[PDB]
Amino acid sequence: KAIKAWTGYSVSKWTASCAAAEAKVTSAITISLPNELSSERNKQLKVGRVLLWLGLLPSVSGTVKSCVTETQTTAAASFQVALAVADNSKDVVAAMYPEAFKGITLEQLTADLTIYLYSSAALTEGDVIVHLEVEHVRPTFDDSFT
Amino acid sequence: AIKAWTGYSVSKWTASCAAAEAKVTSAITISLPNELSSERNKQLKVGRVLLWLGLLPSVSGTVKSCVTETQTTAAASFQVALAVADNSKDVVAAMYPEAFKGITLEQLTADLTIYLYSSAALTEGDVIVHLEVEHVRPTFDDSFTPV
Amino acid sequence: GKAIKAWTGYSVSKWTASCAAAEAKVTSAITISLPNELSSERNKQLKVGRVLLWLGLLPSVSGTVKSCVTETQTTAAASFQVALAVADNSKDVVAAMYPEAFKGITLEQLTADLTIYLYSSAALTEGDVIVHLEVEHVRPTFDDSFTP
Amino acid sequence: GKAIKAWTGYSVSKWTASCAAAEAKVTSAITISLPNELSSERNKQLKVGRVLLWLGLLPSVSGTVKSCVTETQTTAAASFQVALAVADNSKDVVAAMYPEAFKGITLEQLTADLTIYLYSSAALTEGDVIVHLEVEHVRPTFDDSFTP
Amino acid sequence: AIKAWTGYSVSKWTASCAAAEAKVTSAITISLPNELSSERNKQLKVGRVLLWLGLLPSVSGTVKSCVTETQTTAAASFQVALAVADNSKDVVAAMYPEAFKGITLEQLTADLTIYLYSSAALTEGDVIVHLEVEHVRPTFDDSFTPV
Amino acid sequence: KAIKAWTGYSVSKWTASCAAAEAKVTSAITISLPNELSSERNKQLKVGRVLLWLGLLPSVSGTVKSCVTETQTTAAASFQVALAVADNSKDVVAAMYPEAFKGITLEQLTADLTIYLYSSAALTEGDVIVHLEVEHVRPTFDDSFT
């Protein structure tokens, strides 16, 4: 299905391939705004709902977990505070934060939040593809002259 | 058992699975059935797509398959698919009600690809990948020419 | 000059068959093969309606050229002696309409029993005659629903 | 004997094309060129309707002469094998009406795609055949107002 | 912006200006546009005539032009013209609403002439003499012949 | 004043400083889409009205003219076909093409149109600043997942 954005809101996405990691190692994955949103005016737009989900190779065995939280000094801790976790054990490998981050600016979103990934077994580059939604108000612009 | 839309009809065809080694993903090409291979018909628009497997009773281990836009690496196809057809589930099938709406049979045959994964080795015919496609009810010429 | 509307519930399928090389006055038999799109067994049991044959000739095709569709005859020449209508080059319209002679048979029967017979007074080189064939028949119906 | 009224909103444009010299049984291709008066780009996008071709022969033109308008074929002779109507000298009326085969294309498409094919059993000298062509098409419209 | 009469249509075409020396008048011939060059069309009757120039941004000095009955001396044409198209005015144009009513395109092409004057020298293309003509809406054959 | 865009339309701008030019020389000025519009989807948006106007140094003497037209093999010719010209002699040094380019895509706009500038006196870099508006439909985007 599709979950339509709120009136006056838009959606953005950007993904990041997982880095190599050993057994049960939790790794941190960075968040960077896309070039469309890196503009000054767009940076100030307020965020709405959010959604996180993973793309796993068909051979990905063991348990794999990921979530988005305010950056924790230790990577593993984030799960212990995340309001939801994307876990491969579930039928749908996703996790929605419908209101956790409502009200922050895209700048804040990219500044303090981060993606955390955990795998019981060892990982290799490209093993896990991290997908992310960011609902926010529509960027807007209009002008004239003389 | 699922009914088709008004103005649409379902075409069904099968493809065998090539021999492959353990844990290695393979690709299976989509070739249109004869009654759709005519130039008039392949221009038709697609609706919903249904994929469901048939396994030999001896099939063991894990087997997964999905149809997606052709990807450079076969394994990666499982990372953009809406629904996967997996043997560990009750019904070994998947549905793509929204993914491929609007595509043409030309594009369906040329762009998509059936990707199949097995934890263990496979031998030819070990899996029968059945594919079912909704599309506009094909139309036929209904008059003779003068002379 | 006219467009023979097909009967309600019927459609028209059209395909060609290039003539094989032949010598003067030699009658040749051309086999009728169903098009791929109809070749499915599901469709093979459909009931034929009106049948129409008409030729296309190279402008340099001299002499007399005749063709008709009949149940396969032991001798090729004999076919014309029973055909109710023959398409000829010399006539105004090079065609032959069989509104009733074959109604009721199955497309499988059409492929198995009937044959296209072609005769040229002068020698024919391949492609000199393009035997067009237009078969009206019940509209084939595709599967209505998925498989659970 | 008859005057085919053009459709409402359509007009008829008529022009000729003298035949080039040719040898016996040689099929020749004659290029279709729009008349100057229609040649404007503004008009080139007009949609064609019915098309009519008919020949004029010197009274001494013996043998058989055939001509038809078809999408350009790789081999000139083949054109007749697909033309739905052919103008022949031997028939009562040396003409060929295409009421539908070309409806919908643009005059630019008409100039680019179709070709006039001509065949004579005997040798032709220049001007022996005057291929008249009459193309019905939407009425061109001129500018309604000045430029300030 | 000016509307044409009922039963009339406007044909517009342009003519470039030939190189000429200072203060010397030149003549420019009127040639019918292709869509009017057919024998049927050139018999048509004319209505109002509009002349207006386009100057290169570098054009300096005085430039004048008018269309009149062909005169033996080019300069003299400015002495019988109703309105002149001059560059010193706001709009570099002229109008001949009554002068040429009733003339035929044959006569318009054969009798009139576009005369152009410049205080300074001109180089080819330095002026684009646009001409706009009202005339009876040309009519087309609307039926095929028997055979 | 300000001339509001049409319902569902937006506005964009981008300027270009004049190059050096000698007396009465007409120069050509290129048009390049901004990075916001260089994206594939935005490129297809249809244009509406347009406006051109200049910024002159206070010392700019003589006559200066500019206009936007389909590229002409010779630079000077463009004026002879422009539906309006921005000329310093007027009170407001501007020229509006309210409908000349309506219906083309931003790609077409950047491909075939070009800016032409003419100065009776010699010019130097920065002497003339060419300002341009491009009204067009709003770029739009919206998405979802699983």
Short mmCIF file of C-alpha atoms in Angstrom, two decimals, chain D:
data_model
loop_
_atom_site.label_atom_id
_atom_site.label_comp_id
_atom_site.label_asym_id
_atom_site.label_seq_id
_atom_site.Cartn_x
_atom_site.Cartn_y
_atom_site.Cartn_z
CA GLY D 1 -20.53 10.07 -63.84
CA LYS D 2 -20.02 11.08 -60.15
CA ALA D 3 -18.29 13.83 -58.04
CA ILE D 4 -17.13 12.55 -54.60
CA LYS D 5 -17.98 15.51 -52.34
CA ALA D 6 -15.23 16.15 -49.80
CA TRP D 7 -15.99 15.86 -46.11
CA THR D 8 -17.04 18.97 -44.23
CA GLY D 9 -13.91 20.82 -43.17
CA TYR D 10 -11.82 19.08 -45.84
CA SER D 11 -10.57 20.15 -49.26
CA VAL D 12 -9.02 18.39 -52.25
CA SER D 13 -5.53 19.16 -53.55
CA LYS D 14 -4.59 17.83 -56.97
CA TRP D 15 -1.25 17.51 -58.74
CA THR D 16 0.47 15.33 -61.30
CA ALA D 17 3.82 13.61 -61.80
CA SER D 18 5.15 12.62 -65.21
CA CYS D 19 6.58 9.12 -65.47
CA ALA D 20 10.30 8.66 -65.98
CA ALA D 21 11.65 6.58 -68.83
CA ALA D 22 11.78 2.86 -68.07
CA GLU D 23 12.43 -0.46 -69.77
CA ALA D 24 10.06 -3.38 -70.25
CA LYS D 25 8.52 -4.83 -67.08
CA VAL D 26 10.70 -2.57 -64.93
CA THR D 27 8.80 -1.29 -61.91
CA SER D 28 9.59 2.35 -61.19
CA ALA D 29 9.09 4.40 -58.04
CA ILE D 30 7.72 7.93 -58.40
CA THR D 31 8.29 10.28 -55.47
CA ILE D 32 5.29 12.13 -54.06
CA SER D 33 6.04 15.85 -53.66
CA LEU D 34 3.61 18.27 -52.06
CA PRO D 35 2.48 21.20 -54.22
CA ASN D 36 4.00 24.57 -53.42
CA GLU D 37 0.69 25.99 -52.23
CA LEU D 38 0.54 23.31 -49.51
CA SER D 39 4.31 23.26 -48.94
CA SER D 40 4.13 25.75 -46.06
CA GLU D 41 5.02 24.30 -42.67
CA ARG D 42 1.79 25.71 -41.27
CA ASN D 43 -0.10 23.38 -43.61
CA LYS D 44 2.26 20.39 -43.43
CA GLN D 45 0.62 19.27 -40.18
CA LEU D 46 -2.84 18.93 -41.73
CA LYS D 47 -4.51 15.53 -41.50
CA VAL D 48 -5.10 13.64 -44.74
CA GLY D 49 -8.43 12.10 -45.69
CA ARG D 50 -9.38 10.05 -48.73
CA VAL D 51 -6.77 9.61 -51.45
CA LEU D 52 -7.47 8.98 -55.13
CA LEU D 53 -5.06 8.07 -57.92
CA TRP D 54 -5.83 7.77 -61.62
CA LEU D 55 -3.77 7.64 -64.78
CA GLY D 56 -3.74 9.35 -68.13
CA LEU D 57 -2.09 7.48 -70.98
CA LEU D 58 -1.04 8.38 -74.47
CA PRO D 59 -3.50 6.68 -76.83
CA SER D 60 -0.56 4.68 -78.20
CA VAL D 61 0.22 3.20 -74.77
CA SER D 62 0.03 -0.53 -75.46
CA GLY D 63 0.53 -3.43 -73.09
CA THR D 64 -0.35 -3.40 -69.41
CA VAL D 65 0.23 -0.48 -67.05
CA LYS D 66 -0.31 -0.69 -63.28
CA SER D 67 0.17 1.75 -60.42
CA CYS D 68 -0.59 1.95 -56.71
CA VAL D 69 0.25 4.06 -53.65
CA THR D 70 1.78 2.26 -50.68
CA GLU D 71 4.25 2.80 -47.88
CA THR D 72 7.70 2.79 -49.43
CA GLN D 73 8.78 -0.80 -50.02
CA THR D 74 12.35 -2.06 -50.05
CA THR D 75 11.70 -3.69 -53.43
CA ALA D 76 9.62 -1.67 -55.87
CA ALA D 77 7.72 -4.62 -57.31
CA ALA D 78 6.46 -5.72 -53.90
CA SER D 79 4.29 -2.62 -53.52
CA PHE D 80 1.45 -4.09 -55.56
CA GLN D 81 1.38 -7.21 -53.39
CA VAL D 82 0.12 -5.12 -50.46
CA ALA D 83 -1.85 -2.33 -52.16
CA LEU D 84 -5.55 -2.77 -51.43
CA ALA D 85 -6.45 -1.29 -54.83
CA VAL D 86 -4.46 -0.98 -58.04
CA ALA D 87 -5.17 1.26 -61.02
CA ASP D 88 -4.90 -0.72 -64.26
CA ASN D 89 -5.23 0.26 -67.89
CA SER D 90 -6.94 -3.01 -68.80
CA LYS D 91 -9.87 -2.40 -66.45
CA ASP D 92 -12.81 -0.19 -67.38
CA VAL D 93 -11.77 2.69 -65.10
CA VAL D 94 -8.06 3.46 -64.68
CA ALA D 95 -8.16 4.59 -61.06
CA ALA D 96 -7.71 3.40 -57.49
CA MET D 97 -9.59 4.77 -54.48
CA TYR D 98 -8.08 4.55 -51.00
CA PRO D 99 -11.00 5.69 -48.82
CA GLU D 100 -9.39 4.54 -45.56
CA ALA D 101 -5.89 3.08 -46.03
CA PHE D 102 -4.23 6.46 -45.39
CA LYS D 103 -6.73 8.48 -43.34
CA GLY D 104 -5.12 10.16 -40.34
CA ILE D 105 -1.53 10.73 -41.49
CA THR D 106 -0.09 14.20 -41.92
CA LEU D 107 0.75 15.80 -45.25
CA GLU D 108 4.35 15.64 -44.07
CA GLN D 109 3.84 11.94 -43.41
CA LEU D 110 2.22 11.65 -46.82
CA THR D 111 5.30 13.15 -48.45
CA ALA D 112 7.74 11.12 -46.36
CA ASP D 113 6.24 7.62 -46.16
CA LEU D 114 4.09 6.83 -49.19
CA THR D 115 5.38 6.43 -52.72
CA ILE D 116 3.80 6.15 -56.16
CA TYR D 117 4.71 2.86 -57.83
CA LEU D 118 4.32 2.43 -61.58
CA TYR D 119 4.72 -0.65 -63.77
CA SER D 120 4.54 -1.03 -67.55
CA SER D 121 4.84 -4.28 -69.46
CA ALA D 122 6.38 -2.43 -72.42
CA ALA D 123 9.05 0.26 -72.40
CA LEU D 124 7.97 3.74 -71.31
CA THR D 125 9.26 7.03 -72.66
CA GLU D 126 9.05 10.12 -70.48
CA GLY D 127 5.55 11.55 -70.34
CA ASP D 128 3.95 8.30 -71.49
CA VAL D 129 2.06 8.10 -68.18
CA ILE D 130 0.68 11.09 -66.27
CA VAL D 131 0.11 9.91 -62.70
CA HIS D 132 -2.62 12.20 -61.39
CA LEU D 133 -3.03 12.30 -57.62
CA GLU D 134 -5.91 13.83 -55.67
CA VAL D 135 -5.52 14.12 -51.89
CA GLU D 136 -8.44 15.14 -49.69
CA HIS D 137 -7.38 16.83 -46.46
CA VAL D 138 -8.40 19.35 -43.82
CA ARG D 139 -8.92 22.85 -45.17
CA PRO D 140 -5.81 24.96 -44.45
CA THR D 141 -6.52 28.15 -42.52
CA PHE D 142 -4.70 31.44 -43.06
CA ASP D 143 -3.83 34.09 -40.48
CA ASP D 144 -6.94 35.90 -39.29
CA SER D 145 -5.40 39.22 -38.20
CA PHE D 146 -2.52 41.62 -38.79
CA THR D 147 0.62 42.03 -36.67
CA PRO D 148 0.48 45.15 -34.44
#
